[PDB]
Amino acid sequence: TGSVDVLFPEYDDPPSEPITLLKRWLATADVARVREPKALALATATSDGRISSRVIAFSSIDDRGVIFCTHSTSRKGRELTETGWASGLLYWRETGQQIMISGQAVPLEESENDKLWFGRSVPMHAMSSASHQSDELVDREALRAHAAELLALGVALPRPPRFVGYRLEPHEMEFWAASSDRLHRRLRYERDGNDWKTTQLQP
Amino acid sequence: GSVDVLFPEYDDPPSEPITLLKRWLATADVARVREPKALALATATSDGRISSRVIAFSSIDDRGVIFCTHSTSRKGRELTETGWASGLLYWRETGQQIMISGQAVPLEESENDKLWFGRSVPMHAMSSASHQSDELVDREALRAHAAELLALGVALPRPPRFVGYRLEPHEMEFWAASSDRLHRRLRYERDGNDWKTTQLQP
Ligand SMILES: Cc1cc2nc3c(=O)[nH]c(=O)nc-3n(C[C@H](O)[C@H](O)[C@H](O)COP(=O)(O)O)c2cc1C
Numbered sequence: 001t002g003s004v005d006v007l008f009p010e011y012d013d014p015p016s017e018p019i020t021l022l023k024r025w026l027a028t029a030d031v032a033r034v035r036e037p038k039a040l041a042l043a044t045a046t047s048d049g050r051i052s053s054r055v056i057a058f059s060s061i062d063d064r065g066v067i068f069c070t071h072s073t074s075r076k077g078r079e080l081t082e083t084g085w086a087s088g089l090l091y092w093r094e095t096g097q098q099i100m101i102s103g104q105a106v107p108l109e110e111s112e113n114d115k116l117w118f119g120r121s122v123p124m125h126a127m128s129s130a131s132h133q134s135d136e137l138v139d140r141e142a143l144r145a146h147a148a149e150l151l152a153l154g155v156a157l158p159r160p161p162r163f164v165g166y167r168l169e170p171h172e173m174e175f176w177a178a179s180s181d182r183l184h185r186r187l188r189y190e191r192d193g194n195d196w197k198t199t200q201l202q203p
Numbered sequence: 204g205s206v207d208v209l210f211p212e213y214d215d216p217p218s219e220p221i222t223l224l225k226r227w228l229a230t231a232d233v234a235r236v237r238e239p240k241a242l243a244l245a246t247a248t249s250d251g252r253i254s255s256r257v258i259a260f261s262s263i264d265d266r267g268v269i270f271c272t273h274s275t276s277r278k279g280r281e282l283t284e285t286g287w288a289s290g291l292l293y294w295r296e297t298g299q300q301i302m303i304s305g306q307a308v309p310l311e312e313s314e315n316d317k318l319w320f321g322r323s324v325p326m327h328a329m330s331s332a333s334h335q336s337d338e339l340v341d342r343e344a345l346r347a348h349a350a351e352l353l354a355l356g357v358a359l360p361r362p363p364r365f366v367g368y369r370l371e372p373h374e375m376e377f378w379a380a381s382s383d384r385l386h387r388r389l390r391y392e393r394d395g396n397d398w399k400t401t402q403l404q405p
């Protein structure tokens with residue numbers, strides 16, 4: 001299909017919960033053959049307010065938010081511990097859609113972290129265990145050699161404590177869909193206690 | 204070809220990270236990357252809540268990345284309040300990311316004019332009609348107003364709220380995917396006066 005004028009009937013009649021709409025949009029993105037729809041630009045900040053960002057491919061979406069895995073000792077992991085707030089942005093060129101998810105990243109339980117680790121491959125385990133994500137790389141060949149050593153053992157590799165999941169639980173979401181006449185469709189959800197309030201925005 | 208892109212600068216980094224940004228953008232163009240300038244721009248309000256949206260940046264100069272927006276938009280208010288921004292490029296076709304973090308500095312009025320002047324007639328009409336991010340009261344009315352402005356059939360002046368910023372990098376990261384999962388990560392940071400580079404673990 002085209003990158004303007006996607007159908008968006010929910011603009012005028014929004015579901016009560018934004019996660020419902022998020023899942024709908026993601027499912028349509030798959031029908032539309034969007035390339036890497038789950039590539040989320042995740043922004044976090046340090047205590048002085050300085051913002052950093054990187055792509056995360058999220059794992060799944062449950063009824064409460066967007067689940068992803070990372071190293072708790074990485075830059076994003078340290079920032080999340082410091083300040084809690086995060087924002088994630090999806091953008092699909094093929095359909096002219098963006099989704100902003102702003103919330104807090106809630107650490108998952110250890111049992112959930114284990115299940116996430118078990119869902120990955122042994123090569124992923126080996127590089128994840130060998131690398132302290134975002135720390136200075138001193139010796140690239142040594143790192144590569146250690147990941148190869150771990151793989152060759154053929155033993156189950158334990159989950160390093162830094163490998164953890166978070167749930168990004170939104171307090172605000174925006175759904176944006178391009179229009180060819182430039183009056184883009186913008187639907188904002190904001191938490192309102194146990195409910196949500198929606199607004200349409202000017203482009 | 205989304206893995207193991209050529210990256211000699213990983214081991215031999217240019218003195219200025221903008222140099223490498225421009226090199227990568229030129230290669231993205233050769234590789235026919237779709238919308239390579241679509242930056243995920245994050246900002247924050249003073250209480251710490253972060254927000255994000257796509258911005259197609261306008262240009263790059265030796266001091267940073269230039270973009271435009273409405274000063275009264277949600278991002279505009281946040282930029283005024285805290286100054287901090289982080290922009291992220293991601294090119295699926297080549298397995299490359301670039302992170303640009305720093306202060307967004309307002310441009311001068313002459314630079315604002317130039318940015319406005321550079322845009323199209325249809326862009327001007329809707330940008331003049333719409334108060335970006337304010338509540339939309341009546342869709343039909345805003346459409347009609349944009350069309351009326353367009354119909355004036357002359358060059359519309361720059362609305363005062365239409366402004367540019369220069370994102371001046373304090374730190375930049377270049378990431379290139381590797382088929383062996385040991386992704387190439389090159390970080391530049393300002394350490395006092397000049398740039399410190401490091402390679403990072405993936
Ligand atoms: C498509 C794509 C998906 C990625 N998914 C993840 C992920 O799920 N978890 C993760 O820790 N890093 C992921 N990364 C790597 C991050 O972009 C980043 O390099 C890393 O998490 C370190 O970020 P930090 O130094 O800002 O903490 C992904 C990168 C790309 C390009």
Ligand SMILES: Cc1cc2nc3c(=O)[nH]c(=O)nc-3n(C[C@H](O)[C@H](O)[C@H](O)COP(=O)(O)O)c2cc1C
Nearest residue numbers: 241255256257258259271272273276277278279336
């Ligand atoms: C591809 C693309 C390019 C965009 N370029 C800009 C831009 O250069 N400036 C701008 O104000 N909004 C741009 N937008 C719209 C923003 O993503 C956003 O909807 C608008 O700026 C309001 O953001 P805010 O409410 O967070 O302030 C672009 C959107 C898309 C999808």
Ligand SMILES: O=C(O)[C@@H]1CC=CC2=Nc3ccccc3N[C@H]21
Nearest residue numbers: 057069070071128133380386405
């Ligand atoms: O989509 C993927 O597997 C991601 C691609 C690139 C880097 C990644 N790094 C990770 C580090 C920790 C946990 C998950 C990751 N995902 C991949």
